[model samples]
Target: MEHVAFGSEDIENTLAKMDDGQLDGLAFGAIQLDGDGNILQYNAAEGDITGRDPKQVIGKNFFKDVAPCTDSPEFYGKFKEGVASGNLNTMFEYTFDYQMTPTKVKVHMKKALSGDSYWVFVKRV
Candidate 1:
C-alpha cells in the first residue's frame, strides 16, 4: 500500500529534488500535470497504483483519458476549481474502480506557485 503524508514544506522544491525514478520507489503516487490537466509526469508508483501504463498516460489528458474515473466533482472538479482560483490545495479520500477493482485511496491536489502546473498525489487510504 502506497501511503505517506506529504507534510507541509516547499513542495515544489521538495519534488524537484527527487529523481523521477526515485518517486517509483517512494511510498506514494505522483502525477504532475499542466494547467490544462495534461500529464507531464506520471511516476511509476502512480502507474502501479492506478493500474495504468506510464507510456500510455504520460502526455495525455488526465481527467479525460488517463483517469476518467476522476472526471467527476469529487476529483477533477476540485482540481479545476483550484486551478481556476490559482490556489488549489486540498486532500480527501476516494474510491476508484478503473482497474475493475475498486480501491480506496487518498487524493491530493496542489497548484504550483507558477500557476502553470499542478500535481496530483495519491496513496492507499
Candidate 2:
C-alpha cells in the first residue's frame, strides 16, 4: 500500500481555517491508524472535538479514546468483517455535548492509499 504523506503544514493550514460553525457541525478528529489499528496522527481537532488533547491520546490505542462506543466484541468483529468485505463507505450520526452545548456530527470512513490507511472525515451537522 502506498503511503500518503499528510504533513503538518497541511494540518496546520486546515486547522487555521476551522471555524466555530463548522466545528459545531461535526465531530472532528485526526487519526493516523494502520490497518492493524495503530494510531499515527492524532491532532488538536480531535482534542477540541472530544475535549481530550493529543498529549493524552496520541500513541495510545485509538478505539479506547476516539470511539469506545464501538468497543464491543461484536462491534470489533463487525468492524473487521466490514474491512475485509470492502464495505467501508459507512455513514453514521452522533451527538456530543461540547461545553454543555449539544453538538451533532456525521462520520464516514473512506479507503485511502489502496486500503492501507483510512481517512475518517467528520463534519458537524
Candidate 3:
C-alpha cells in the first residue's frame, strides 16, 4: 500500500474553498499551532465547529481561545508538557458544547518540522 501525506497548505486551500452552505453541516476543524501553542492557522471549518473565526482566534493563543475547556491539567496541559518532553503523537476524543449542543470530536495533533508548528485536525460527531 502506498501512503500519502498532505501538507497544511493543501489542507488550508481545500477547506477555504468550501462553500458556506457545505460547511454549515460539517463537523471538522484544522488548526496550525506553534511549538509554544500559539495559533498560526485556523480554518473556516474550525470556525464553523467552534463558532469562531481566524480573526478571533489567530495569534490569541490556543489556551486563551479555548481556555478551561482546553486547560485540562491532564489532557491539554499534559499535551503541552509532552511536546517539551519529546513525547509526540497525542490523539483522543473529547466532548464539549458546540453551539450550545453537546458534541463529541476527535482531535489529532502532530508536530510538523517543516512548518515548525503542530497541526490539529478535528472531526466532530
Candidate 4:
C-alpha cells in the first residue's frame, strides 16, 4: 500500500487496514462514529489536538454532546445526509467556536471501507 497522508483523497482505503490502536499514530485526529452520530471511537491524536479526553467522548452523541457547534447544517447536516445515503465522503475547511478557542482546521468525513461506520478526520491548520 502507498503512504497514507492526512489529505490523501483515498485515505479511507488505507484506514481499513488499521486497528484502533494504530489510529492513534496518525498525524491527524480521527473520530469514528456510528450511523446515528454516536461516538464509537476516538483516537489519541484527536484528544491531544482538541484537548478533549477520549474516554469522556466515546459513546456520546458527537454532534450534540461532544461538540454542539457542529449541530448545524454545514457539519451535522452533511454527516446525516452522508449516513442516509451510505456514501459520506467530504472535505472542507472549518473553525471551532463553541467550547474551545477558534481553532482552524481542515475536515474530512467518510464512511469506512469495510464497515457500517463513519469517520470524521481533522487536521489543524
Candidate 5:
C-alpha cells in the first residue's frame, strides 16, 4: 500500500498480519491490550520511554498502572469509544504523565478483528 501521514499504513498492515501476540520487529513501542484494557504485550522502547519494565508491565492495567495521565477523554476516553463501536482506529499526540516523566508521543490505536483485542503504538515525537 502507498504510505501516508507518517506511514501509519505500514504499521496498520503489520498489525493486520499480527498473530499470537508478537511484539517485535517494529521501530516503535507497541502495547497490546485485551478488551478489559490490561496489557497483554509491550515493547522495549515503551519501557525506555516510560521508565517502565516491559516484563513487569505485561499484565498490568496500562492506563492506570503504566500511564495514568492518559486516563482522560483525549486518550483513554477515545479508546473506550472506539472499542464500544468494535472498530477503533485513531491517532493523536499524547503526553504520558505518570510515575517517571512527561513524554510527548504520537499515538495510534487499532482494534483487531476479534473485536476484543487491540494494539496501541506509541512513537515519541
Candidate 6:
C-alpha cells in the first residue's frame, strides 16, 4: 500500500484521484468540503476515528453541525481566513474534546487543486 503520511507531498492532487475505497484505506482521516464548509466527503477512517458516520455527516456543516468544537477562533477563524484568501494550505495541532475523547491530531487544511473545494486531513497522534 502507498504510505500516505500526514504531510504527504502533493496530497491534494493525490486525494483528487481517490475513490471511497482508496480514501477509506488511508490511515488518517480525509474530509472534503465545499466553500460553504459543507462536508462533501468523509472517509471511513475519519468515521472510525472521530465516531461520526459519513452518511450522517456528508452534506452537513463541518464547523457547525459535525464538529462544533472547531467553530471557535483558532480553527474556524483560520478556515475563513483561508477561504477569503483563496489559499487554505494551513496545518496545526488540534485536540478534539467536544463530545468525544481528547484525541490530539495533526490537521492539514487545503483548497482542492481540481476545483472550488477544500480538504481537511487529520492524523491522530
* Candidate No. with top lDDT: 6
- Best candidate according to TM-score: 6
Instruction: Name model 5 segments beyond 4 Å from true.
Output: 1-7, 10-13, 16-22
TM-score of each: 0.86, 0.56, 0.68, 0.91, 0.83, 0.93
Q: Model 6 misses residue 12 by how many Å?
A: 0.8
What CA RMSD would you report for each candidate?
A: 2.8, 8.9, 6.5, 2.1, 3.5, 1.2
Per-residue alpha-carbon lDDT of candidate 5 for residues 1-125, written as tens digits (9 for 90 to 100): 22223336556555666543345555677788987789988877677777877888888897776678888889889989888888888889988776667778998888865557887888889
Model 1 stretches with alpha carbons more than 4 Å out: 1-7, 113-115
- Candidate 2 minimal-lDDT segment of 10 residues: 1-10
Q: What shift in Å separates residue 28 of candidate 1 from its native position after superposition?
A: 0.2
Model 1, position 41: C-alpha lDDT score:
80
Off by over 4 Å in 3: 1-27
Give the lDDT of residue 35 in candidate 5.
79
lDDT values of the candidates?
A: 0.77, 0.51, 0.62, 0.85, 0.75, 0.86
Candidate 3 structure quality by residue, lDDT tens digits, 22-117 = 433344566767777787777666776677765676787786555347767755776687678654556688765634466677776765543456
Order the candidates by TM-score, highest first — what do you get? 6, 4, 1, 5, 3, 2
lDDT score for residue 97 of model 3: 67
For candidate 1, what is the total of clashing residue pairs?
A: 0
Better of 3 and 5 by TM-score: 5
Please say which candidate is ahead in lDDT: 4 or 6.
Answer: 6
Q: How accurate is candidate 1 locally (lDDT)?
A: 0.77
Q: How many pairs of residues collide in each model?
A: 0, 4, 0, 0, 0, 0
